[PDB]
Amino acid sequence: TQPLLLDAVRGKEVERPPVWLMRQAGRYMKSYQLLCEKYPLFRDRSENVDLVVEISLQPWKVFRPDGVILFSDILTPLSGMNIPFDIIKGKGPVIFDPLRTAADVEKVREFIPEKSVPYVGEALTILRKEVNNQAAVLGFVGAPFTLASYVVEGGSSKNFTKIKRLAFAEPKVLHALLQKFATSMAKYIRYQADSGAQAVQIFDSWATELSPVDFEEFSLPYLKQIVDSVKLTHPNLPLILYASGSGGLLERLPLTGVDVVSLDWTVDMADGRRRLGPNVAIQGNVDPGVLFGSKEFITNRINDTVKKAGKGKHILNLGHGIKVGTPEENFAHFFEIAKGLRY
Amino acid sequence: TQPLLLDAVRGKEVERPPVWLMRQAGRYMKSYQLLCEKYPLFRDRSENVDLVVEISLQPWKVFRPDGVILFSDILTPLSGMNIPFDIIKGKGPVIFDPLRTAADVEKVREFIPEKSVPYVGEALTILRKEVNNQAAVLGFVGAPFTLASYVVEGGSSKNFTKIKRLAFAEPKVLHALLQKFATSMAKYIRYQADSGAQAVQIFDSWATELSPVDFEEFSLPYLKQIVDSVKLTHPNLPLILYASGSGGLLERLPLTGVDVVSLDWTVDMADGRRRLGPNVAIQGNVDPGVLFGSKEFITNRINDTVKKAGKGKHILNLGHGIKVGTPEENFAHFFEIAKGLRY
What we know:
Two copies of one chain form a homodimer.
Chain A: H1 4-10, H2 31-37, H3 49-63, E1 67-69, H4 77-80, E2 85-88, E3 92-95, H5 102-107, H6 113-116, H7 118-131, E4 136-142, H8 144-153, H9 161-169, H10 171-194, E5 199-203, H11 212-218, H12 220-233, E6 239-242, E7 260-262, H13 269-275, E8 281-283, H14 295-309, E9 314-315, H15 328-339
Parallel strand pairs in A: 1-4, 4-5, 5-6, 6-7, 7-8, 8-9
Antiparallel strand pairs in A: 2-3
Helix pairs in contact in A: 3-7, 8-9, 8-10, 9-10, 10-12, 14-15
Keywords (chains A, B): Chlorophyll biosynthesis, Chloroplast, Decarboxylase, Lyase, Plastid, Porphyrin biosynthesis, Transit peptide
Pathway (chains A, B): Porphyrin-containing compound metabolism; protoporphyrin-IX biosynthesis; coproporphyrinogen-III from 5-aminolevulinate: step 4/4
Binding site for substrate (chains A, B): 23-27, 42, 72-73, 150, 205, 320
């Protein structure tokens, strides 16, 4: 027997919608906050196996969700790919030498997960045993565009004028870098699946900063490459695309070939279910800010969301991560209502 | 004879698309930067008539755009409405006593522009004379939800858990405050129109933080009230709705009754033109980051954007404001190509 999440996604008939909440912050339960106080900061957040397995497992223990995702910073592969970086306190990520020329791109090294992040594959095999097919273990990787965005911008960006200048002035250079991330992230997906991941979620929220026609050129093609390539070696591994602010890109997301599209809360469930087509599955739509409302309110929203999503092909979740100051009770309530739903 | 912008919007046949760029930063030409150095900070940015008329006029002089918007912080009316605030250096806006109870809302005072911001109506009559119907003078006001968002959150927010908690836990209180802003912002629109504004742009980008069904309750209704109320006293005054991140709300924007919807760059022009219906006009769609590309690139994008928008009912513009480090030349190029277009 397979976990609910996997059947729902595969389109198999289910009696209820699998459910789990995102941004399963170790900084929500104050469990990553106590483990974070004991000194490496780069090594503390997304690196070690025992702290990865713990942060990852944090939500599983309290609510036993239908899905548990790997807690690993999507940038982790940078180091092994020859792109030196670190998480500076207050600035977040910072790549020391932002790519800018074809010459810089050529320097980029193809990722080798087993060698560069063996702990990832280990945490996954552990997580797999912990859950004991009572939930689905989800991998997590960064997408080519969002990745290139970080290494070209040098770090977190709010304007992306550097990646866009590269995209809109020297496309060949960016295309070469996007290619490198595609080939490397595909490999990474196979590694995680091979290590216990039963579905892998791909992060490319930054690509929604692009106009659809631009998205069609600097993101879509490379997301599609990963899917096509992975589907070839791991035919049954479900891939989940997550990209907040995709309200204007809905119609093109399915063209990537991903099995499931994670919709943010700005797109109505009914609208999204329609605009995405009927084949793809959808991951939870609820606005994280809804968890700040009355219990009745949260219930109405979960109900509306599941009603509009349909009886199947739906993994209930939020449109984004749990906001920092969310009352734990309203959180428990969400799972209570959610788990008692029957199609 | 009326300015191009007004005819295009009114749906009258035009030979070319009116054009202008947003975020006509006095901090783009370094003209507000030199005037900003000479000491009031609150009084310096959006207050005085001579510095308002100057910042506002900054873009007009260099490129003579088809539209010139009033440079006034949408929060300005707060003071006169009895909601004390100030722009603290580094924190931006800060309301000293964030509304939270029905009691606080009842305290709110109905705005009286002539009395509280006479300089606004003066700068507008001046701007009107300066342009001499060789461009359209555009008013600018904040929308009820975005406004309430600022006064409830206490200032700029990125999570909006306070306004949403109020919306989702104590709706009656928020509805009462939204009502107050609607009635007051309508009055403000009449004042600006009466002072020379030939079209007024309404800012409600924060309402796109709301799920469509939530938007349908805490934004749409009040935007509609303003339009219906204003259309009653100023039947021919075009109203422009601007709300970035509206990709999932497109279909409901027209229901507000606004004459023109400003689309951001995440929604393709063709898609937006279709999803919005055929009656409403549309304000420029170009991604500000495109101005960092090759000239050829910028040209292709302006062309694609105008092609998809149609031959009329379109005010070419960006989807957002000009990014801070934009090469002035690529900016001149945009106007060059833009102004040479003929339907």
